[PDB]
């Protein structure tokens, strides 16, 4: 089931975009914290909410926009390598150039923040963004920021960086991830606009956490589960609570910056239009929401994948237990256990009865289909061939996989290989289904089934190898494993 | 001036603390958090509340009372120091047993947290202890602590500790400092006397933040100045927020370690009392104010002088402005300049009209009095004689000190120590003004003088050396310095 | 596959000399054996001829005369030290350890824990798991003074405090799970023990790294620089021995430091010091046993190179400055040697120069070198397979050996239903189509009787490796190094 | 007692480096590894040779010699430290060469458009100093191809250094002094002057066993793993004569000789060794008075670490690598000569314990009083034996003592009275204008440079700071005072 409105967040948010430049005077500079493209946590937290629906939010107010790209200085010269899509912040950046361009944004200006020795390689950088028709603002490193306020809104402050010359009233100031000086940028660039005459101003776009839900909402908590660090953690808006004596939800870094973010803007604007860092905020997310409980019960469970994800990477790096610590903690905030998740006790359950590495699914249907470690198969193969059989409707006593199919795939691992365990993992058994779907109609049946194995859930007792993640991520079905080896 | 009211809060804390207990059972471990003897900042920050002024507390319950102190096994094998005092965790253990033992107070029992048995240096302490007639009993690493709260209470968790045989119902729990296991010790130990049959309880005992003073309070904030971690800083209780619908504050750590806390006391006592860490502390303070604007005063100079601290501090050590930047949000959140420290400007006035160091105080009389950098004398020197003069009420004319006492000391430091410096440092100034007193009866009048210069603020434009500094420290005056060296 | 090193030579001279060095140190010999004991891959490729479990086929010569005694310390198992090695715990590989010394018919019926405490419980609940295997185990305490103060432990309140183990054969060689197992330790005990009960006991070293009468510059030992991670096992000139005896031979800094100490503790436990030397000390023999020094010094040379192209690769996967294959590049200037040297290495890097994707390359048995490129169908590394499979056949070139009845179930998975636009075919799925096709076919089964003598093959590929690849290319065999970039 | 020639020094020295450019043809780069000015380990350690021994061996070939300072791109921008900084050092060598009247007119820049980079190039020609300019290679050791070409040493700005003999010296290690060396000979081979390369350093001393206390003392006094004296076996498989080197330069060693080859034809150099030019061993007179000092050494250089460790909290890794040596040596801590009478009195007095030995070979103790810090104590009866009064005498006015010990008990709050040294110092020069006995002891100070001194508790910093303005060496064991 959904519970967010695509369409209704689309309208909604992008005219709260634009209110909130015309009460500033006529131009924004918007800074976007977070993912714009591939947001898969509000995806599977928010039902309905797709991975790209910030860049369809913009693409309602298309001819309004100017995108306006930040990175660090440091980040080109450390070839600061970004974990997501593994590439460096410098082709990170001419990524975000085209991508917007694809898709029919303006882009034609890249902010080169915390410029230091000027250097060969930010030369290098200059002239191949000047060959693809983007114009460079080069800045620098502010003395006394973020403290001296006098130095700041001053020439010898702001005015050291090169003032980016945009178009049009609507800035969206983005970056390939965190310390590119977005902020700062935004700042300095209201500056300059206030020294030329034009009103301006600033404001923040973030999806989570969202303010008009309370802390102990199930979506809040949830975004605590997708974080690291005490800096993320969500607390009540103190700002917003003593101005207007209603609480709202916001977080550690930016309550704690916002003190001189508001004396800054102070001498920036005569007074600031913000009292709280709610009030710089435009997120309209929480009023999108169209069925709570269904975003109730996904976030609970994105909290759930979160503690056993946690597990898993602190079993394999051989890290304390810090990160996983943390999502218990939310568990018991949200009120919730680890049962909850409904593949978690039967995946457990079979390996109790067996001694041998378990497996369950639940199926779009509502059912859990398990699987076992046998002589022929291991447990998640065994799992991925009961699914298919029980959604195409096959009896459960019928074999279909043949043994010509099976017999080259094992010869092969035990004569040339040297396996003393002949088990056929998750790309063998799918093989050699399909070769079995040359002649058996049953096998062809089943692999028709397998597109339907998407968003589905999976716990497994034992953490998987390299193949079994491989073949899981590709079918997009949704897995934990107790975080214990073979 | 005095804005505290000591009388009552030792009568009010103390039965509250007792009222505490008689709701829980009857038997209470109250965990002490902060310094307790010396608390040099409160004393600062609440004008009327005395450095002992918990102890004083305490001693209106002598006889119900007993102190436990904890030591973590691996601050042993680190050699962890209290920075305050200049002595290692193991001798401040020793020190807060003999202390208490002159006070009156029974302490018999040190519990040892986080033992190993491969750790040779904390079982020679173990036998060091054991022949000054003291009880030790051994805590260990519990597996699965905060999160298995069936590992943690059972054979296998507090199970595996041993037991304090507490004679008194009133259990006073205190440590050296932070990291040595005295939540932990206070949950083992009602777990050890649930088994037994007594009714146990816990509790936790701070100064500060005061709960029940708003978020805003200067009080409040000049704690936030004290700190050097986001963990530490000042949160509103959602938690009491949520449960009450009344605003208290909290902070970072106890609110994120809350959640596994309270699911602990419910499982150790059957239900739990407490619906948030507020009702989980006991501190009074805050209903004992007795002048507002006198404490608010104390707390935002306080607020100044950590500001100056921090940044004398980074100059040192060659760290970045973290923790200065920090105190600058705290002068923000205030609505306070650094100039609102009166002897600030004075001092730099004199280094813009001189081209040397300058130097200022303020008298308890509320006289600005600075000093220069002479031939003869530093400024700090300077500055000293010229207190002493105005607060004895020698005419500014007369020099109070002979060149009988001065020469020695020139001639030492030129000839025989090879300086080309030969002005007096403060230590040296006090021997020639000490030698000059014998003779003269102006230089005994000054020398009188140095009594009444406890507690009074100085301003420096240059870091002090460690023999000013310590010279400073032990007349109580409170120096801070702009971020500069000679 | 040419061999340089006198494998039943060493087999007659190294126990010749072992015994040798008993009967000159009165009858009785504790032997340390430190390093890999069954599976010396680097001296098998290092010294060709030498058998990965070259020093217990020596010993399996004189096994009559020979007790092993597995020591363990008793702190690594409250710690829970785990061998990297195989991924078992210091507890059950001395199990591991004792039942395949028995499968040989060694005789095992002793077993040390050094460093034991009566606080420590789960160290005496292997105690009784222990008695009731069929062994005695003896135990061993901690020394206060150990090693720097002489005066404690010699007399009782060291050694004195050992219990002593009653060993039946006159040659008893000490082993260990790992190092810091207090083995040496254990060996001075033991002849404290039997010095006191009237038996002529002493100890010696069974190192086979580095080879103490090969020159410092030699590519043998250079190699064993080559494969050290650590700095404190950096081979040196045992100056001792050159200020003793005049001779120039080869040790390493633990070794020569512990020296000075270790010579003091002789004395005392023997009367008058048999070793001058780190060298003395040792009974290697393996450097007598060399039949072809140019065989070895090739092969030797390969291995830094190997070990180059595995330390860049390494960095580039876990994220790391380049350390230690900037000291993997210094032995290669030691040995006067340069990455080209492995010969399938610019042959590869021509590949991805003509094509501008991933390539690969294999030097067969008979030393032809055969290429792969990245076309539609294959990925690099399975290309170079069907190729060097086909050239060691005798098949032909123009011959297709993948039958599309086998690729096609493969391809339409991969496409329709895995949802990837990677149609590409990996090793493993190859040699699954090359399994399938070698039914209809006997092309493809002659090919497949052919991936058995890709053992010992080097391999070059432009590209890090997937895990899959390099799973199978270690299955087979194959020796493969990598240039640090991804596709 | 003096084991090192100093005159001998000066010429042997700069004899030995003139005869090394006729070698090489008419020229020569010569890389100065290490301290220059103030080299007080030497000192100590090869007793005549002076802390500035170096310069003065320089200053007799003065007119044969330029000096060129090397300094790294990367060393200005992090603010790269040594105890002021890299930023000011360059502006401090060239002022204080040009003093005793050194010629120095060339500064190269190692490691394009920098802001404080090209700012520092019109500070240099505006105080007189012309500057080259040299890039990075890719491939720095291995691709010899790409270095002597057009590629690597051809884009380098060539310095047109006037005398035969340029000694290159920089702030600090890794300043790329060598780099520019051998780009400055590939230069002038191009412009058909022969010139060549030679190394510099005083320690290791390569004519002395490896185990010899004075190179010893040089592996006790560095503080990196990779810094240990290793037997030059390039020197060994070539001549057959044993000699001594280090890790890094053996390690170094084959890359650089290929470049060698190249950059000169023929090789000049089979070892580090050869490479080298020190005579600091053939200049010792004393080889038993050499062994004694640096024995001291490596014990005190112990200590250091100890009393380092103690303070900071940090792991006995240095300590421990120090004991090594000291076995090493064959010497216990036990042998530094004033550590057993210093404890003994601790073992008595159960108060904290001290001890110096005087020029003249005497042990003098010290002990805590009421009155006396047992430095204190320890400072008033050394100076009373120097000056030649007799030990009963008391040489401190009870006039001078009285207002010191008021002061720290009224009026500055503290629990103990007694007096640390820069306060028994002060005591002593008021009674000296009364008392002759004062006087003759305070004239004695100057006879306390270079005496031992162990005390059995750490110093603070006020008795730390006396004994350095003193000259006097102070170990200590590593424990504090009770509280």
Same mark, same amino acid.
């Given at each position: 089931?959904?519970?967010?409105?695509?369409?209704?967040?689309? #309208?909604?948010?992008?005219?709260?975009?634009?209110?909130?430049?015309?009460?500033?005077?006529?131009?924004?500079? /918007?800074?976007? !914290?977070?993912?714009?493209?591939?947001?898969?946590?509000?995806?599977?937290? /928010?039902?309905?909410?797709?991975?790209?629906?910030?860049?369809?939010?913009?693409?309602?107010?298309?001819?309004?926009?100017?995108?306006?790209?930040?990175?660090?200085?440091?980040?080109?010269?450390?070839?600061?390598?970004?974990?997501?899509?593994?590439?460096?912040?410098?082709?990170?950046?001419?990524?975000?150039?085209?991508?917007?361009?694809?898709?029919?944004?303006?882009?034609?200006?890249?902010?080169?923040?915390?410029?230091?020795?000027?250097?060969? /390689?930010?030369?290098?950088?200059?002239?191949?963004?000047?060959?693809? !028709?983007?114009?460079?603002?080069?800045?620098?490193?502010?003395?006394?920021?973020?403290?001296?306020?006098?130095?700041?809104?001053?020439?010898?402050?702001?005015?050291?960086?090169?003032?980016?010359?945009?178009?049009?009233?609507?800035?969206?100031?983005?970056?390939?991830?965190?310390?590119?000086?977005?902020?700062?940028?935004?700042?300095?660039?209201?500056?300059?606009?206030?020294?030329?005459?034009?009103?301006?101003?600033?404001?923040?776009?973030?999806?989570?956490?969202?303010?008009?839900?309370?802390?102990?909402?199930?979506?809040?908590?949830?975004? #605590?589960?997708?974080?690291?660090?005490?800096?993320?953690?969500?607390?009540?808006?103190?700002?917003?609570?003593?101005?207007?004596?209603?609480?709202?939800?916001?977080?550690?870094?930016?309550?704690?910056?916002?003190?001189?973010?508001?004396?800054?803007?102070?001498? /920036?604007?005569?007074?600031?239009?913000?009292?709280?860092?709610?009030?710089?905020?435009?997120?309209?997310?929480?009023?999108?929401?169209?069925?709570?409980?269904?975003?109730?019960?996904?976030?609970?469970?994105?909290?759930?994948?979160?503690?056993?994800?946690?597990?898993?990477?602190?079993?394999?790096?051989?890290?304390?237990?810090?990160?996983?610590?943390?999502?218990?903690?939310?568990?018991?905030?949200?009120?919730?256990?680890?049962?909850?998740?409904?593949?978690?006790? @039967?995946?457990?359950?079979? #390996?109790?009865?067996?001694?041998? @590495?378990?497996?369950?699914?639940?199926?779009?249907?509502?059912?859990?289909?398990?699987?076992?470690?046998?002589?022929?198969?291991?447990?998640?193969?065994?799992?991925?061939?009961?699914?298919?059989?029980?959604?195409?409707?096959?009896?459960?006593?019928?074999?279909?996989?043949?043994?010509?199919?099976?017999? @080259?795939?094992?010869?092969?691992?035990?004569?040339?290989?040297?396996?003393?365990?002949?088990?056929?993992?998750?790309?063998?058994?799918?093989?050699?289904?399909?070769?079995?779907?040359?002649?058996?109609?049953?096998?062809?049946?089943?692999?028709?089934?397998?597109?339907?194995?998407?968003?589905?859930?999976?716990?497994?007792?034992?953490?998987?190898?390299?193949?079994?993640?491989?073949?899981?991520?590709?079918?997009?079905?949704?897995?934990?494993?107790?975080?214990?080896?073979?």
């Amino acid at each position: 089931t959904i519970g967010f409105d695509r369409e209704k967040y689309i #309208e909604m948010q992008s005219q709260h975009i634009r209110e909130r430049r015309e009460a500033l005077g006529g131009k924004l500079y /918007l800074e976007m !914290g977070g993912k714009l493209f591939d947001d898969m946590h509000a995806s599977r937290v /928010l039902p309905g909410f797709t991975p790209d629906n910030k860049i369809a939010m913009l693409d309602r107010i298309k001819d309004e926009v100017e995108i306006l790209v930040c990175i660090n200085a440091k980040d080109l010269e450390r070839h600061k390598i970004r974990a997501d899509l593994g590439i460096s912040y410098e082709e990170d950046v001419l990524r975000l150039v085209d991508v917007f361009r694809d898709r029919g944004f303006l882009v034609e200006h890249v902010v080169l923040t915390q410029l230091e020795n000027d250097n060969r /390689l930010a030369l290098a950088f200059i002239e191949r963004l000047q060959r693809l !028709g983007i114009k460079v603002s080069r800045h620098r490193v502010i003395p006394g920021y973020p403290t001296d306020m006098d130095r700041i809104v001053s020439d010898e402050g702001f005015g050291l960086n090169e003032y980016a010359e945009t178009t049009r009233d609507l800035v969206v100031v983005t970056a390939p991830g965190p310390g590119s000086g977005k902020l700062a940028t935004c700042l300095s660039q209201v500056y300059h606009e206030h020294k030329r005459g034009v009103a301006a101003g600033y404001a923040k776009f973030e999806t989570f956490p969202i303010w008009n839900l309370p802390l102990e909402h199930p979506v809040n908590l949830a975004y #605590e589960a997708a974080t690291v660090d005490l800096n993320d953690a969500n607390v009540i808006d103190h700002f917003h609570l003593a101005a207007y004596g209603e609480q709202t939800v916001n977080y550690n870094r930016d309550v704690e910056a916002f003190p001189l973010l508001k004396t800054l803007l102070e001498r /920036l604007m005569g007074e600031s239009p913000y009292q709280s860092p709610t009030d710089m905020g435009v997120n309209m997310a929480g009023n999108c929401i169209s069925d709570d409980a269904a975003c109730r019960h996904a976030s609970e469970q994105e909290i759930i994948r979160r503690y056993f994800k946690a597990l898993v990477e602190e079993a394999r790096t051989g890290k304390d237990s810090t990160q996983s610590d943390r999502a218990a903690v939310v568990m018991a905030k949200a009120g919730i256990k680890a049962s909850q998740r409904v593949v978690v006790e @039967p995946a457990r359950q079979v #390996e109790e009865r067996t001694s041998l @590495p378990g497996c369950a699914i639940e199926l779009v249907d509502g059912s859990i289909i398990t699987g076992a470690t046998s002589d022929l198969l291991g447990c998640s193969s065994s799992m991925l061939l009961n699914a298919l059989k029980h959604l195409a409707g096959i009896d459960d006593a019928i074999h279909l996989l043949s043994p010509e199919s099976i017999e @080259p795939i094992q010869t092969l691992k035990t004569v040339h290989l040297g396996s003393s365990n002949p088990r056929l993992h998750t790309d063998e058994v799918l093989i050699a289904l399909s070769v079995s779907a040359a002649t058996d109609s049953n096998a062809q049946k089943a692999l028709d089934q397998l597109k339907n194995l998407r968003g589905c859930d999976v716990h497994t007792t034992t953490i998987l190898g390299s193949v079994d993640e491989g073949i899981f991520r590709n079918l997009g079905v949704l897995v934990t494993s107790d975080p214990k080896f073979q």
